[PDB]
Amino acid sequence: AGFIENGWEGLIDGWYGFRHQNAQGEGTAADYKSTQSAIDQITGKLNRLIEKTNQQFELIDNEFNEVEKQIGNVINWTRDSITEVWSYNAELLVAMENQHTIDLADSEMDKLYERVKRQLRENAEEDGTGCFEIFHKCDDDCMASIRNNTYDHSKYREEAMQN
Amino acid sequence: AGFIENGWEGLIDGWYGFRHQNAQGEGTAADYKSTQSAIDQITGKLNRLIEKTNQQFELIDNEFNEVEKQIGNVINWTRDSITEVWSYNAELLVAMENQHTIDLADSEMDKLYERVKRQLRENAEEDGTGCFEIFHKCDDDCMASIRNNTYDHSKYREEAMQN
Amino acid sequence: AGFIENGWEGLIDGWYGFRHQNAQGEGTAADYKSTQSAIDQITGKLNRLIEKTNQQFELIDNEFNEVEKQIGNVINWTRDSITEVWSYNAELLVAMENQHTIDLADSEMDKLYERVKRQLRENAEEDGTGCFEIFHKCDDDCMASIRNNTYDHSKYREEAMQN
Amino acid sequence: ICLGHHAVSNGTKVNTLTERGVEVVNATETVERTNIPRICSKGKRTVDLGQCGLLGTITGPPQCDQFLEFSADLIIERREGSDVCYPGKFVNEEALRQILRESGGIDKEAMGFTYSGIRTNGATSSCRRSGSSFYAEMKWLLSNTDNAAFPQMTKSYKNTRKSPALIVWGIHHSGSTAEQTKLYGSGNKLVTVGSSNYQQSFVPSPGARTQVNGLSGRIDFHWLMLNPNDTVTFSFNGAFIAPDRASFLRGKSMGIQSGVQVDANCEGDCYHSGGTIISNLPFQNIDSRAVGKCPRYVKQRSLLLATGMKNVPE
Amino acid sequence: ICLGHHAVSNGTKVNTLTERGVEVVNATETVERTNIPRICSKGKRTVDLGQCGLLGTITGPPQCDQFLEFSADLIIERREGSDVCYPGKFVNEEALRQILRESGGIDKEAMGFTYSGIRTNGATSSCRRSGSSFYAEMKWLLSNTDNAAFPQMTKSYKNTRKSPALIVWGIHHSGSTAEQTKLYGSGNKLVTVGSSNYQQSFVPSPGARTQVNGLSGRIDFHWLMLNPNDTVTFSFNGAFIAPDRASFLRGKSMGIQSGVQVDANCEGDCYHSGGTIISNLPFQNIDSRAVGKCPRYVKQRSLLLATGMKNVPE
Amino acid sequence: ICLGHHAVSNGTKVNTLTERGVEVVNATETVERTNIPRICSKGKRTVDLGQCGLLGTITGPPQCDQFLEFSADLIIERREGSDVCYPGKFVNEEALRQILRESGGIDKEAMGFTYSGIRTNGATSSCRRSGSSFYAEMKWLLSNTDNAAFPQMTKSYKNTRKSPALIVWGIHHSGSTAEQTKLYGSGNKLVTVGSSNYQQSFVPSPGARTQVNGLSGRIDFHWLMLNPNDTVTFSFNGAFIAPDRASFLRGKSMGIQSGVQVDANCEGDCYHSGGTIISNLPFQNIDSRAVGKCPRYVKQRSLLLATGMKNVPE
Numbered sequence A, B, C: 001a002g003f004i005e006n007g008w009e010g011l012i013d014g015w016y017g018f019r020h021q022n023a024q025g026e027g028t029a030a031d032y033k034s035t036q037s038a039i040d041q042i043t044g045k046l047n048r049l050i051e052k053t054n055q056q057f058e059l060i061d062n063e064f065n066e067v068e069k070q071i072g073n074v075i076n077w078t079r080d081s082i083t084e085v086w087s088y089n090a091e092l093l094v095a096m097e098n099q100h101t102i103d104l105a106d107s108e109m110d111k112l113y114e115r116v117k118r119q120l121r122e123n124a125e126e127d128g129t130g131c132f133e134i135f136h137k138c139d140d141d142c143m144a145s146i147r148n149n150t151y152d153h154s155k156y157r158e159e160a161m162q163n
Numbered sequence D, E, F: 001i002c003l004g005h006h007a008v009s010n011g012t013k014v015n016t017l018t019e020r021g022v023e024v025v026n027a028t029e030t031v032e033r034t035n036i037p038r039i040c041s042k043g044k045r046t047v048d049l050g051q052c053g054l055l056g057t058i059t060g061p062p063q064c065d066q067f068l069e070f071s072a073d074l075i076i077e078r079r080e081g082s083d084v085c086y087p088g089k090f091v092n093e094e095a096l097r098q099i100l101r102e103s104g105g106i107d108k109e110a111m112g113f114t115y116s117g118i119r120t121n122g123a124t125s126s127c128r129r130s131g132s133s134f135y136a137e138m139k140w141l142l143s144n145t146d147n148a149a150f151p152q153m154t155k156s157y158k159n160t161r162k163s164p165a166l167i168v169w170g171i172h173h174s175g176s177t178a179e180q181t182k183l184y185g186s187g188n189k190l191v192t193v194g195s196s197n198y199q200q201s202f203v204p205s206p207g208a209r210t211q212v213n214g215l216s217g218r219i220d221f222h223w224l225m226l227n228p229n230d231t232v233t234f235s236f237n238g239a240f241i242a243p244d245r246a247s248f249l250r251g252k253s254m255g256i257q258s259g260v261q262v263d264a265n266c267e268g269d270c271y272h273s274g275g276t277i278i279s280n281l282p283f284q285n286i287d288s289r290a291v292g293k294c295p296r297y298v299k300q301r302s303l304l305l306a307t308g309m310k311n312v313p314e
């Protein structure tokens, strides 16, 4: 989400995808692998945080008949201290998990971009805004081979090389 | 801060910058965008940590007339436990925040380097030590266009390509 | 550990290394720098976590002659609360440290790959699976110069360039 | 061919380590706030004490007649409950309450106390049953006639079980010295209770108190836990409410204080006075004094966890 | 054209998860250590008790004559303060102290106790005012002449307000039995105090103690919180320090123990015995028993937070 | 030329923030579970009380005769230890125990109490030495002959040191009123103890108790800490166990309860009833009530820390 200026509101099929415009027409598709990886890691993070505590705490005060004032002030003091501890732990936990989540999604996008660059060696150039400027008409079946990770790195080499 | 051997002590205008030497002369400038982003994130981290607690804790012991020894030992025991908890939380908090800060600055530098490589496609090469070996005399106004992110990727293409 | 399909079980000399096959024969070697950096950071993490607490806690209960039931239930209540706090802190600590460790190793591998690409500018290509497809017979002494970071970027330039 | 990510029109603002208000795609809640205003007791043996007080289940006032040998996994106290019919007070109230909340119920058994030359059926107007009665588990020890003396008696009981027993006796503080002499006789009275862990020292104190239920006298209940095979002894010369039956804890249970209804249609392990907290979230902002297996209470009303990528719209 | 980052000659060493001593550019402190040796009470109603003890404000020794109806947001106790003029001691000291620290002040009102046939003005040398006086809020109940008897009296007071009242009475323990008979008369004395939540049982104990202020007698002060519309009752036959006026809590306040000066030029919400902690940092290493709205105390003297990039000099 | 990383055949599964069971190369343990079933006391002055109870070291029963002036850095209590020879009980037991555990030992010194007209050597069968003896640090104060009266005496002691003193006296509760009159005389008995911080009020209570060691009487031990230069006073007319010598704390020590053997071959700073925890790990799962310098107890049995890269085999 850096050098890519903004996200695609029309992309409702997944989290990441390809938007191609050649000589045949326009199209948008979703990359199942990176999206499923991201939602798998975030889903596992949720499942790790959505934990049920198996520790039982009994009643230590009394709402109907107040306990003695000294031991009651000690109980309230300890309970307030623990409350501060858990408020801090919750704040820091949520903040850190959100940071690692956002940077995780950015890492997934960056790795998808890097591998798409790994497929197209010298047959295409980079523009700087997350696009791959092609120098050989790539047919819709050729771009479908790009999405399927089956693009031959050398059967379009010289053609897109002399341009 | 990896393959870049060391920092520039003379760079007093910002955190990141360009040091160019062509055919016209020498010069150093600062990149306002990446530096302002880094100091914005670190500044926001400070503002997130420099928080004032709105929870009031009352006096539970007595310095002039010591309370009973049993309840006093319980109070000291609980207070020492909470003290250990907050010492641990402070140590871990500072350590993690420092780690994420350093790696954040390294990420900002790496992204600046990556985008400067995104501007210069085939008109220049990479040396390995954070420099861009140019193969066309680039004028001082051309390097000023590099810093302003206005370098035309194709109006110097063949000239720096046949070298 | 991403676009590299799997690890090398035969690599028993270090954590990262080079496996080269040219015209002379086969071979595997270990990169001392990246491995020593990784084990230095992880070792320092262990030394930071393997800390001895200098805080002494005295006996507050009594196993042979049970204390009064009210103050005993308060003591058990506080001790159980602190136990929950330290269980949570231990779980989160171990999880976060493991995450940062794995991503740290992945970062070291990625930086080694990136610097090996920094050595070989236009004299070789990238395949996409963590290999460097050479286009000039590189002798075993040439690959030993690659591992020693002494490969001349231009004395094999045109030869591997016209291929 | 270009690459990109998905976005939405209206995102969800979350907080991170660096900024506060970063708009992402999807985010879930981690702090529970929804509360069910009922006591979810599905699949649990539940005893709603109602007008009966917890401690009363050991002494047995009229309102506790149907709770003398209860058994439950969850015990519910009500603010209208009362431990006493005759005006009085327990010593170490909350200790015995906390003991009885996790007892799993009580099991009474006659201690076998026979008396010779002493009237044993003392009653009062405030302990109404068919007429004037007393605690169903206690014996108000008085003199034979409207006066005469009280013999300095001693009675012992050996815990013949494998679990500790709950021993509860009473010390009657009359409305005046003349009434103490009328019920037991003149002279200083003493009640001694002894065992291996207990060793205590009672003496009545007659006087005038506020008219609770139209009465000025008081009765102070005391208790001790008797270890197996160990004997408890009493040496008293008057002003004594003797125990008829001893109590034995059945097992484990849960004790809560609430004012909402019981509902066997929902199940929950986190209770407070306003209901049940049924949630999988790790935190809650309902009641700090919630008991059971609860999410840990925090002060924040909400803490949004980012479940999606950062939202960057056009 | 080359790219690079900034550096400095002398960096700041910080600690991370991987190493200890990583030199970075800039770093700030997170553990507070600077302490102001004053009580910053700017904009707060402050009462410096000084030589007056906190509990004394309810009984009223001479040194507390100007604190009988104080009102404050911050209460400061001094180690030279004393609760008593006549040598004595409060029962449940720290409980009543903790109650009075957050009370926002006290509000006295005469309880309306009239006596018939009993001398009401007992004084002592240690409670000096114009001559020999006593507690300004208490009445030392004695016999009419140098002897005769003490009638077994009973007096009641109904809390006619909406907030609980603070009831404090006294039990005089004379220097000898002959002096107890000289002040009240022979025979066993009893003081009974009763209400809906209270039910207690006093009896004097004459004897010789250490000469504090040149005196061997003692006075034990007791207290209870009376709920609205509920009545407190006393049945006593001698050795009684009766309450003249009852106390009512004004609101909320803060109570600290300190030995430094009051300074209305600075504002602070974190106090300890050595002064005020005015800091925005999340942690502090001054006093673990600091009270108010304080940074959380840690054991580490310093914890440097990295605010800049790693420093790599040439 | 290709690049790659190392792997293994059988990795170690660890848990992270995203998944649970990620197989890595190497992983170490962070939760300690190995326990040494001994008391590692290498280089520490150790006192194994054995059959002697801790509190007994102040009163001095026979089994504590060799512990009257002990000195240690580590104190070990045994479940077979006993504080008393004559059947009795301390008031504020665990407070005095916690005081004596960190005292570094005790130092006795004769208080200098001389008596005139009162028999001072009272003994019992259960306190066996050469014949019938008593507490080595106490004096059972009785009447001259088998009856007569007990003069109302008063004795004082001034703490002439720089550290607080431990003052322990006794209140004898006889088996019957006739035995109390036989040992001290008829009439109400009182024992008054006074100082600057103490002010208390004892009175015996004769009666029958359970036959512990074949005896029905009891002795209640009481204590107070006397500040330097401050005087403690006693005014008693019978039923008094007087202190012979006062105790002074030596310094600092550690007190544990254990049932395992002492071993001077290993060193450890974390102790529990089952032994010593010698570990560098930050957490432990042995005993939650472990004392000393211990790893912090957690509920998890194991928590594997990843020390290597993720393991991806072919």
Ligand SMILES: *[C@@H]1O[C@H](CO)[C@@H](O)[C@H](O)[C@H]1NC(C)=O
Pocket: A066, A068, A069, A070, A071, A072, A073, A076
């Ligand atoms: C503890 O706090 C509660 C409020 O949650 C309050 O009702 C109670 O009175 C406090 N305890 C004491 C002893 O004041």
Ligand SMILES: *[C@@H]1O[C@H](CO)[C@@H](O)[C@H](O)[C@H]1NC(C)=O
Pocket: B066, B068, B069, B070, B071, B072, B073, B076
């Ligand atoms: C608690 O610790 C303080 C030192 O901060 C000490 O003065 C006090 O005596 C301790 N409490 C008891 C009951 O010993």
Ligand SMILES: *[C@@H]1O[C@H](CO)[C@@H](O)[C@H](O)[C@H]1NC(C)=O
Pocket: C066, C068, C069, C070, C071, C072, C073, C076
């Ligand atoms: C506290 O827990 C222990 C078990 O570790 C138990 O033996 C003890 O009885 C509990 N305390 C009370 C007062 O029940």
Ligand SMILES: *[C@@H]1O[C@H](CO)[C@@H](O)[C@H](O)[C@H]1NC(C)=O
Pocket: D026, D027, D028, D029, D307
């Ligand atoms: C968004 O998060 C909520 C949290 O429970 C989840 O139920 C929902 O399915 C999520 N939606 C998407 C599109 O991820």
Ligand SMILES: *[C@@H]1O[C@H](CO)[C@@H](O)[C@H](O)[C@H]1NC(C)=O
Pocket: D228, D229
């Ligand atoms: C209890 O006493 C009986 C008979 O005196 C004996 O058979 C039994 O073993 C004893 N049990 C224990 C636990 O002491």
Ligand SMILES: *[C@@H]1O[C@H](CO)[C@@H](O)[C@H](O)[C@H]1NC(C)=O
Pocket: E026, E027, E028, E029, E307
């Ligand atoms: C360094 O950090 C301190 C922390 O308060 C700040 O005041 C100062 O402005 C910072 N300086 C730079 C150059 O970042």
Ligand SMILES: *[C@@H]1O[C@H](CO)[C@@H](O)[C@H](O)[C@H]1NC(C)=O
Pocket: E228, E229
């Ligand atoms: C208190 O009593 C008065 C008169 O007896 C009555 O008017 C008032 O409603 C009562 N208030 C409460 C809270 O009981």
Ligand SMILES: *[C@@H]1O[C@H](CO)[C@@H](O)[C@H](O)[C@H]1NC(C)=O
Pocket: F026, F027, F028, F029, F307
């Ligand atoms: C694996 O970790 C353990 C942890 O103590 C260590 O002793 C061992 O040397 C490590 N081995 C390798 C190959 O890293």
Ligand SMILES: *[C@@H]1O[C@H](CO)[C@@H](O)[C@H](O)[C@H]1NC(C)=O
Pocket: F228, F229
């Ligand atoms: C204790 O008293 C002695 C003599 O009365 C005196 O010399 C000494 O200074 C006093 N010490 C203290 C601490 O009061």
